[PDB]
Copies of this chain bind each other. A is one copy, B any other.
């Protein structure tokens, strides 16, 4: 019906909210790890150089 339909379009949209905020957390996480990897990679470049 109509009262039922408007409940599905909210429950679906409320879901992708939680599925969006989980992606934004994933965005922060493996962007920290990306900077972590560049840091080690640049550190080892420096080390291999002075060696």
A25 lies within 8 A of B29 (CB): no
Once A27-B3, A45-B46 are accepted as A-B contacts, the answer to whether A32 and B18 lie under 8 Å apart by CB is no
Residues from chain B with a CB closer than 8 A to the CB of A3 are: 27, 31
Copies of this chain present: 6
By beta carbon, the residue of chain B nearest A22 is B18
Tell whether, in the assembled complex, residue B22 and residue A7 are in contact, meaning their CB atoms are under 8 Å apart.
Answer: no
A32 pairs with B29, CB closer than 8 A: no
With A46-B42, A46-B45 known as contacts, the answer to whether A25 contacts B35 (CB < 8 A) is no
Shortest distance from the beta carbon of A44 to any chain B beta carbon, whole Å = 10
A38 partner, pick from B8, B21, B22, B39, beta carbons under 8 A: B39
